[PDB]
Symmetry: C5
């Protein structure tokens, strides 16, 4: 097996999509191995640019094809370069721009903490014919940066592992184990936009819904709380588009459901207060003194749900 020494340089991470859980990584990859010595013009290394690499692979040069496993589509490989040294070592440099995909988990949605993963692996040569020695990831252009809404926290974690493939067990009997490099970058979402845009107005609307009890009539109370029903209908539209159709519920939609429950509870309470008249004349003050009980109960429900 030949020892290849990868050195990825993340130039930028952008386009971080949460609907499809993809992101775009732009950067450089530098693989380096050693082979039989050769004679170059002079004793200085020879730089062979893009589309001149095919004039050398045709003549018998060995350049492996390192692919990215977790990519969506194919990478947009721009320039590429091959440095040939007289002492016998080859360096393959390339520029990649990929739409990578990782399994994201938005259980906590506004205060979410995710990681971006690049997986690199030879396409043809297993670990008996090509092994990765080491990786250095030079993530210095995004070291502590706000990319669009993510803080990139700390360094990048690098790992080299062996993967078993079973569809190649019928064509390669005992050597189908492929070397693989995994690079993980930890990112933390910036919750400020959702705090001042999706949580403060929901707080104001729910507080206004609490204040419907201070009217001294009935039909005016019903009409006002139905208007607030319509208003909290609007926020389902306003928050639908930012996230995927997840089977679980996040914090933002837990407040939406709590707002629906509060509106419906207030309407049902004033309806039952209208029907509490056993003789048609009895006034209700114990159930209408929920002006201190309903906000405290909502705070307790919100606290037990958030805890």
């Amino acid at each position: 097996p030949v020892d290849v020494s990868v050195s990825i340089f993340i130039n930028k991470i952008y386009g971080v999509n949460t609907l499809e859980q993809t992101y775009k990584v732009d950067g450089y990859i530098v693989a380096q191995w050693t082979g039989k010595p050769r004679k170059t013009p002079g004793d200085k290394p020879l730089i062979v640019e893009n589309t001149q690499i095919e004039r050398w692979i045709n003549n018998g040069l060995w350049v492996p094809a390192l692919e990215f496993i977790n990519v969506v589509g194919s990478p947009d490989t721009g320039n590429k370069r091959l440095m040939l040294f007289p002492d016998g070592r080859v360096i393959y440099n390339a520029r990649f721009l990929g739409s990578f995909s990782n399994d994201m988990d938005f259980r906590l949605f506004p205060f979410d903490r995710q990681q971006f993963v690049l997986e690199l692996e030879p396409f043809s040569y297993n670990n008996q014919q090509l092994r990765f020695s080491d990786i250095q990831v030079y993530t210095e252009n995004i070291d502590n940066e706000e990319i669009d809404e993510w803080w990139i926290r700390g360094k990048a974690s690098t790992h080299i592992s062996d993967i078993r493939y079973d569809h190649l067990s019928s064509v390669q009997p005992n050597q189908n184990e492929f070397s693989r490099i995994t690079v993980r970058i930890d990112a933390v979402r910036n919750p400020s936009y959702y705090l001042w845009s999706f949580i403060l107005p929901l707080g104001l609307i729910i507080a206004a819904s609490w204040s419907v009890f201070w009217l001294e009539s009935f039909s005016e109370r019903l009409q006002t709380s139905f208007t607030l029903m319509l208003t909290v209908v609007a926020y389902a539209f306003y928050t639908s588009n930012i996230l995927p159709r997840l089977p679980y519920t996040t914090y933002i939609d837990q407040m939406i459901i709590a707002g629906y429950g509060s509106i419906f509870a207030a309407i049902l309470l004033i309806i039952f207060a209208h029907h509490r008249q056993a003789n048609g004349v009895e006034d209700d003050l114990l159930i209408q003194r929920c002006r201190l009980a309903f906000p405290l109960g909502f705070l307790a429900i919100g606290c037990v749900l958030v805890i």
Copy 2:
């Protein structure tokens, strides 16, 4: 006829679109056949990478073109590889990423059960010149997984069949029958998101519409039920985008139509109660005691429609 032994490895299924009934399958295809023996360097097999396969097909190697029938666009074939063995057998490995399309049926929409189909077929050689022996589908990366909102249920069903083509009956008189491989993966939708997002608030709004009868006036009742008309207008917008313009109706839109019918029935009932005054003085209590009759009738209508 030469016997080709396909072995598809589904790496992932994603991007499952219901508006256009397409999905994206990313994976590997491994075809294997046998030919005349040859001399390789040594006695070890020879790996010929991408764009070096054309230097061999030009010299006279026989590599068939296996296409995907149900694809939208063309597959984004990334790397490809050709293993040539000294004993005479050839193995063609390729990586495919396709936007496939199948005929989906959303009669039941939130509890829907669908299947994803890959169809593979030679482009040029009929079953007198190329036959498929067997297929093993290695769907172990999506075996029991929630891809975005689908459970993948169990194994993958594989089939090999013969297809008649009639536009080639004028150019190939008696041999136009093409071998074909069909792979079906059964997926079950996850109804949780529609349960807590599109059914619970419609239930609350329809219950609030039931509670309009407990007012003791007339014009307040009319204004309140028209506000609820507007609110259920909003949910047509809110549910329009998730599905294709189907000629039939699903469960979600059956509840939308039931909500429209309930609002209009309540408005028409209170209008007829206002016009039931034969002398201008007669009060109505039998038709205004539908506070127990309207929810039970709605439950019976919903139950007979759902059954």
Copy 3:
């Protein structure tokens, strides 16, 4: 002139767009002509796959370039194939996927009947050098099918004609007449979705607008009819996106305009009833008995407009 015998096989029609009046046709094209005899390996026909056709056109083979006239962009030609027979005849098979465009007419919008047109024509050789003998269109995969919302009615109509081109009259003096094949498939829209989604709720809202006269006040009538003004404002949004900005009006927007006219007529009528008080005391009953006159007048207006 050489006689080419085209045989198109429509595999599917999908993506039928009405905003841009394009559609996507996926299928196969099989052209067949005869030339000088040749020696193949044995006496069996020779199949030359994709990218091996260029090794034959370089050596002097004659393969014409048949283009599609009404295409948007360029076709996504996938595989292609060339069958060379020892008796001297050549067969060029190709797989095409095109975004074609035809002049659609949505005068009647929900009950619309359109046709999908494929036009095929040589790029370089006029009818003195290349003539089309016949076409057989094998539309058996979409024969009577609901593609997304269109019934495909019956067979496909095929035509072969000659087209004059006048920009080539300065470079080809008397022979600029190009052969052309036109294929027309008749499709009929499925009006069910618009019936139960865009016409039933507009009917309910217009009926509720008719029922505003049964109030016995004035300001309540004005506020209610302005709420219904807002509701029919919403349907302009709800129906804007499904169709192109046409200079004429369809059935759906004729109902939108009729709803606007009904709301404004009711508001103007109750305003004039408020101002009919010549002494400030005279009550109006003849103009307020339009509870039977307004729905009948709306039905007559709708019937004369639809007829």
Copy 4:
């Protein structure tokens, strides 16, 4: 300098975008020049198709690269063709599909009159080495047609000019003047859709806003005019998407601003009528008789603004 005689054939103009001020032109280009004589097979002209032109440019044929200046992206050149005549003249035919861009001016928006411009120019050879003799534009397929919403008015205006380039003044000292062809097609927008969709309902809503004065109360007037405030808020959404963020204002948004001013003027007038009570008892009839003054004043303001 060699004399090239271009002959553009506009096949269709479509996709006319106003947000980005681009449009798509599909058609053919035919350039023709004369060179040294040559021997062809026989004495008939030789047709060299796509990808066979490179076998001739490698051997020393001179084919200039005519580019389009005002294009967005690169043209999607489909087929191309080269006719070589024994008398010594060459004809280069190509099919182009370009997203062209022109500086549009929507000062008058619904009754707008624009022109579509194609600019063609050699890439390498200045007018000392390549001159354009003439252009004939064969715009007969779009001569008087409604493309999507534009009438194409009359013929196409053709011009041949010389352009100075100053970045090539440091590499070409005295000859950097490039020949150029400009083709202008005049199109007139079809205002019918905006008349019956964006102007008639704004007229109805503004008329209903005029009719708020005929109420005989105060708070009902305030609530009604605030509902109409909300309704004219909706039309900002409804008209935002059809046009670019222009620094000036068009006719449609001038009516939106006039509607906002009318609603606010009516609200401020009834507020000042409520506060005109110097003793708390004085009734106002001169300022409340604006039921004839407000519509006439709005008509005068609209007329002076439109004139």
Copy 5:
């Protein structure tokens, strides 16, 4: 090191996206260096077009690959050209169309001032093997122009610097310093559209919210201010799409938050005025005379926030 003399000609800047902070630059690049002399046909310079450059790089010509660092995707290089002079100097001209990306800062959003940056750099040769002598940027086509909504202010600032790369420090020990050219163009946003579209109606709605105190009731005040709550909910939708989810807040959203605070303050004030009745009979005039205090306080809050 060889001295390359770049000369960029910005043809246009368009497509300026603020959601993703990218923009599209279309133009020409002209690099020029000197080498060993050569014999051309005659003594006139030799123009080698696109795809004929590969016939010269194969024979041993030295053409460096200048890449753009801050690009998204890869540039859409259209035509390219190579001028070879007998005195020994080479000129490489190319046409580029790139989606470039720069770090934008929308702290002030409507009156924003940004700059568009092009960064150009050799891919393979460091500054010991390739140095940039100078750059002239010919930005005369966008000199003082309104591109879509940006004024381009003045000339373009050009800079040539040296960049250290550390992933190449393991393969190039002491010479990994790459020459680089940065071009900055200063653009100023045109605030007119946001002034007459997003600030004038928010001013009108906030003024109408100030005018809720002039009612002489309580429940009518509450219902009116809740309607204005709904109206300012709509503008969060109306302004969400124009900008990225920034952690800070701009001017437009500061007015949105001020409108929410004003509505909630008015509602809470009238609620506390209803509960100021210590005996159930005491009328409030000092707290209800905020008709002059609330607008002045809002003006002071807006002024201290804007300053």
